[PDB]
Symmetry: C4
Subunit: 92 residues, 4 copies
């Protein structure tokens, strides 16, 4: 968690999710929790059962995916290392 590389990826991920939450809650009229949910399932590629209704929201979502998918998967990978390492080091 002290690893600056992990810390920066965390910050970038949080900032990207905040931006999506603000966007979808104000332009697409979603409750904050639903805007955050939509942002997360979009950038992790899980998807969900809704899509943006406005043209602005569709264009934003296209750009958001290309801006954010690589960072989010970089963060998920670094997070996975941190989470599994204590179990690996106990199982040695």
């Amino acid at each position: 968690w002290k690893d600056k590389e992990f810390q920066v990826l965390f910050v970038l991920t949080i900032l990207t999710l905040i931006s999506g939450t603000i966007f979808y809650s104000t332009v697409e009229g979603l409750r904050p929790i639903d805007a955050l949910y939509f942002s997360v399932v979009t950038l992790t590629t899980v998807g969900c059962d809704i899509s943006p209704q406005t043209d602005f929201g569709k264009i934003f979502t296209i750009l958001y995916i290309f801006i954010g998918i690589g960072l989010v998967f970089g963060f998920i990978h670094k997070l996975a290392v941190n989470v599994q390492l204590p179990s690996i080091l106990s199982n040695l």
Copy 2:
């Protein structure tokens, strides 16, 4: 043989048990549907349904971030340590 593979297998199993319990309690799904939802979420396939409760939405966000990395680490190790050697062995003329 591979202790990292052992860890990822056990952690994957525990992660899917946790999701099965969570979605069957909080989202009211039958256990098999809760397991299905957990699997398609963490492999990023996705489901035709989404959580309905705010607790379910929050949990799912955290489950995604922790669970994708573990499940795909397991899938990668399964491919290199189990599936690839089996394919190669099954291609040998005997």
Copy 3:
């Protein structure tokens, strides 16, 4: 296309998609084209707007994902190399 590694991945992918098409068209009652579509969008993780209705179909789908996702992405990667190489070699 003569690369045996690519050829084997193609065969494995086709056989896996045939199995899913047979399964979903007979157990989940989908038309063949819809059963193939469901099999493809599942193993590529795109997803779609339906899910299996039977418990047997849900269990099959879980196992199908773990049996098939790695092969399908291996094939997609090898296919991408083949498809882009003529353009790379013309752009040198």
Copy 4:
């Protein structure tokens, strides 16, 4: 500078144009919706809708297999050649 990146960018753009034309003609989508569908399909996010015509289903299957590899090759090159250097530059104290 990177000719592989140039190729993947152009092929990605052409792939998305092709999908926009296809889904707006065959599936009747407005152009922006056809582009949206193409992007979420090839990045594997998925859409709340699916093709309705058999032509659309067949095309989508082929588009997925050819398009995922190109779009994710482009995303990887964008990350290593553009986004990573920019982040690093923007972290330098000046």
